[PDB]
Amino acid sequence: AQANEDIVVSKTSLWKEMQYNRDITIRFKFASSIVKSGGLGYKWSEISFKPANYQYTYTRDGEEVTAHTTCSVNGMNDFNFNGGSLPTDFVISRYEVIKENSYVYVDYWDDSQAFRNMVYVRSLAANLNSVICTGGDYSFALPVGQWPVMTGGAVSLHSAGVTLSTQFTDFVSLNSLRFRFRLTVEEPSFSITRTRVSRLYGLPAANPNNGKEYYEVAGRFSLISLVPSNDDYQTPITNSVTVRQDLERQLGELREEFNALSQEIAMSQLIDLAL
Amino acid sequence: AQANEDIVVSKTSLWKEMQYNRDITIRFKFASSIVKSGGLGYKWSEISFKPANYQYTYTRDGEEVTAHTTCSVNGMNDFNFNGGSLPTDFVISRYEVIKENSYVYVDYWDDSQAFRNMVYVRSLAANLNSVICTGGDYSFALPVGQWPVMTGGAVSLHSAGVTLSTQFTDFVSLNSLRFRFRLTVEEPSFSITRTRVSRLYGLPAANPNNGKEYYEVAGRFSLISLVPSNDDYQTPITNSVTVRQDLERQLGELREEFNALSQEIAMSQLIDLAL
Amino acid sequence: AQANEDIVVSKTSLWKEMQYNRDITIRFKFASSIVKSGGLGYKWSEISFKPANYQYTYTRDGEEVTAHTTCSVNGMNDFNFNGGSLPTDFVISRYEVIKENSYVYVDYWDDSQAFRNMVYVRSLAANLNSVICTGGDYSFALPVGQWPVMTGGAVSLHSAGVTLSTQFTDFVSLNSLRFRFRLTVEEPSFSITRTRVSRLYGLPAANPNNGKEYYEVAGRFSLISLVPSNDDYQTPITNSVTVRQDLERQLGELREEFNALSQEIAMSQLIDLAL
């Protein structure tokens, strides 16, 4: 049997149960959200994860296959480090770490025949190989003084159950395959340099990629889906999203008031610099 | 005939028409969005509603059924109250109130068989019982002076038409059932203490829940859906959302601007503290 | 024959293949996002496009049909204009323009039968006529100085391929038809007045509607869709979205910090009015 088979286990007039058994190259990537509190610059608000899309195009056995992957994390632990109540001590209100109790979700999609009209799926199963995700080096750019660097962190992702999901984005909506990963803490630990914290396992949520373009893991998946017998039917993929108009309005009002305040401030500095 | 039946009104080679007639306990909940303008703290920008999720797990007749509800409002009336044009007068540029002209929407979903692959439905109907919803007690936190409190408001929710809908979220996407509700004013009227306004009907948007963990209304729904005869197919439920990336970018630019302005202000405040 | 046909090209127990061929009135609309940087008010951070919803109701040949149209743009170029490094020169960090290399997407939907349970489509085609899109006059509200006005700009929208799409919103979710448009620059150019920029082509992202209520283009489409033979099945349309809760949380922290800073500024300014 080919590595990229496609078989029919039942076929009525309009519908047909098509089996698919195919190899895949999941190339995903974390993405971090860094919110820094105001004042001088010595207090950071959040260092968390954001679901991250990554579209690529790889080579199958004489075919070019475009893909779309989306990495997310669930059940992460919220740590924090506060060394003083004054505006000049380095503090991080809340930063996220990954351990055993957390999980790493990866939605995957391709331009192949398996994902063209997939809305129903049974007999789902996959053979995935394990990889090692290592964190990088994030230099907290303080206004003045020293520059602590959050450096280190290694954690091994192991295959787990598989499910379905939907990758929503501002361009495409994809009925996609959801691969789960569990975590086993590894030897390289992450530590904030020039600080009283070190030798704690996990992965940091500042620079997980470690300056990499992606994390690669190869796999195979096997399912049975409902596809119309005619191989010309198409399910809507693209999107045109206008969600959270109330949020857009809130942001517009905030920008208006912020421009008014900055105007008032620079006017106070202009009158105080017009002698 | 049972209360939670499951019938097969037809069956083809792959698909099947199934009828589902089931009892439900809609435990829903509102959620308010408050926005406080800058300046001193006597001026409020908006007090509105937001679509509010609530997931839970209730006992059926010997089954534990996990449920998921999402409330929302439409056609609400935007009242205002301005005591003057000064920084020190209490003013609320806009706050939302629920009345007869408006409608309340409640999306409902469960982990039962009626919802697993529900994409098509007909003969939809439900017999819901009416309830009462009373407003809360929201104490406007003013910087200095007395503390006005929005207190009162009671409206009875009457059952109306039933339809389908979709509960999108950052975790799950659900093909759900949409109960509609109309409103009738009641005797308890809402009013702001220490203010020249009172004896006006409706339900405030500051605290509708009245501190209740949820509002509860029982119901029953009967319908007929198209499901695959093989009860192993699964429709995609989970999500990994990255919608409004342009909005994320705008928020990042606004954070950068506000951090730079706060750093400027803090430096200008600290230069005067070196004597 | 008919202009609004509905044919049955095949039929089985529960499903069927229907062919719909209908005339339509695509009344779409552009929308701009004008972000103004802080400071004094001479510096503009960005002027971009945003996907624009517009819903209406128009008269077919004795039928009154409700419709919904969502415009978007893709591949738009980013131009910039800096007059100096000072706070007092009129600078536009970025404004978006449309040209040949770019494309305009229009997702279209009606309440007619062709869209009631459309999830699968084949033999999709369309005949569209060309229209003209022209820019208005966006006067930049400079606090002091002259008044630059971005004016002009005209482009011819020529039809292109048709596909499927999904219009998502905070209210409705529509499995819609995606008409694509390619562009050819016209003679009327866009120019900012009292400024050293003119005789450059494209469409300004400032006021693309030209003060109009919509841009109307007639059309006709033909397709072949899979529908339940029982013409009573309904697919979920309405929504209740709670997406980007983390973004809402970041915006709320931003608002709290901004209110605290504004309170500090206002107390600092009020303490100097006690004589």
Side-chain angles (χ1 to χ4, degrees), chain A residues 9-24:
Chain A
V9 309
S10 294
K11 177 164 181 176
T12 183
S13 301
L14 300 175
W15 294 85
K16 54 166 184 181
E17 298 179 336
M18 282 211 76
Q19 184 166 25
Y20 296 106
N21 299 318
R22 289 181 186 276
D23 287 3
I24 49 165

Side-chain angles (χ1 to χ4, degrees), chain A residues 36 39 53 107 165 243 245, chain B residues 46 233 238 240 242 244 255 262:
Chain A
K36 180 176 177 171
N53 307 127
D107 295 327
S165 282
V243 175
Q245 299 294 75
Chain B
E46 54 177 338
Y233 292 103
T238 47
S240 306
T242 75
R244 287 292 197 190
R255 287 289 298 164
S262 181

Side-chain angles (χ1 to χ4, degrees), chain B residues 230-247:
Chain B
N230 195 343
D231 58 330
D232 299 331
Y233 292 103
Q234 293 170 4
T235 313
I237 300 298
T238 47
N239 304 143
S240 306
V241 180
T242 75
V243 164
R244 287 292 197 190
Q245 208 75 350
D246 176 88
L247 212 172

Side-chain angles (χ1 to χ4, degrees), chain C residues 3-223:
Chain C
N4 303 329
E5 299 165 12
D6 43 327
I7 304 155
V8 192
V9 294
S10 292
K11 178 151 178 162
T12 182
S13 303
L14 307 178
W15 293 83
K16 55 167 183 174
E17 297 178 349
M18 286 203 79
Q19 191 185 359
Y20 302 103
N21 306 323
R22 298 180 178 279
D23 315 12
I24 50 171
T25 314
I26 293 154
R27 296 173 180 173
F28 68 96
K29 190 200 289 174
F30 291 94
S32 60
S33 187
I34 318 308
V35 183
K36 177 170 179 179
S37 93
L40 298 168
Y42 283 70
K43 317 189 286 187
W44 268 260
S45 286
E46 55 179 10
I47 291 165
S48 64
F49 288 107
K50 274 284 184 184
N53 293 132
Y54 177 59
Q55 64 195 245
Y56 58 96
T57 298
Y58 70 102
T59 298
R60 217 172 257 175
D61 308 331
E63 277 63 76
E64 193 71 3
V65 46
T66 299
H68 190 292
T69 306
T70 297
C71 183
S72 301
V73 190
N74 199 266
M76 61 222 150
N77 288 338
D78 305 335
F79 293 172
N80 52 2
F81 170 74
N82 57 275
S85 64
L86 303 98
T88 59
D89 63 270
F90 173 67
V91 54
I92 319 189
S93 299
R94 191 243 294 184
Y95 59 100
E96 282 184 347
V97 71
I98 318 188
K99 288 198 176 187
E100 304 99 48
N101 61 85
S102 68
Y103 294 111
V104 172
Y105 301 145
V106 190
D107 312 5
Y108 186 82
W109 178 93
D110 299 336
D111 66 347
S112 305
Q113 195 71 38
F115 296 87
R116 279 202 175 89
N117 301 318
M118 195 166 67
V119 195
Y120 309 99
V121 173
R122 62 177 183 83
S123 299
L124 178 56
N127 302 130
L128 290 162
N129 56 335
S130 305
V131 302
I132 319 191
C133 290
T134 56
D137 301 70
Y138 186 72
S139 304
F140 296 93
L142 273 172
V144 71
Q146 296 189 340
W147 274 63
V149 194
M150 197 175 194
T151 167
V155 73
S156 288
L157 290 175
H158 295 293
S159 182
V162 53
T163 52
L164 292 95
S165 276
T166 328
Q167 302 185 47
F168 293 109
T169 50
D170 197 74
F171 309 139
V172 300
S173 174
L174 272 44
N175 293 274
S176 145
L177 223 75
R178 161 63 67 78
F179 304 100
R180 202 257 291 283
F181 292 106
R182 70 194 181 77
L183 302 106
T184 58
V185 294
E186 289 212 330
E187 155 168 9
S189 163
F190 82 103
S191 54
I192 295 161
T193 320
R194 318 198 200 187
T195 305
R196 57 153 288 279
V197 295
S198 294
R199 197 57 32 80
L200 195 66
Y201 301 99
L203 189 72
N207 194 333
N209 294 334
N210 201 335
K212 295 189 187 180
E213 54 266 24
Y214 51 80
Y215 286 114
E216 183 176 353
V217 62
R220 192 193 174 85
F221 74 99
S222 170
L223 47 70

Side-chain angles (χ1 to χ4, degrees), chain B residues 8-20:
Chain B
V8 184
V9 306
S10 293
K11 185 166 177 180
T12 195
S13 302
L14 299 173
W15 293 82
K16 54 162 183 179
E17 295 183 341
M18 284 203 72
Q19 190 175 7
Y20 290 109

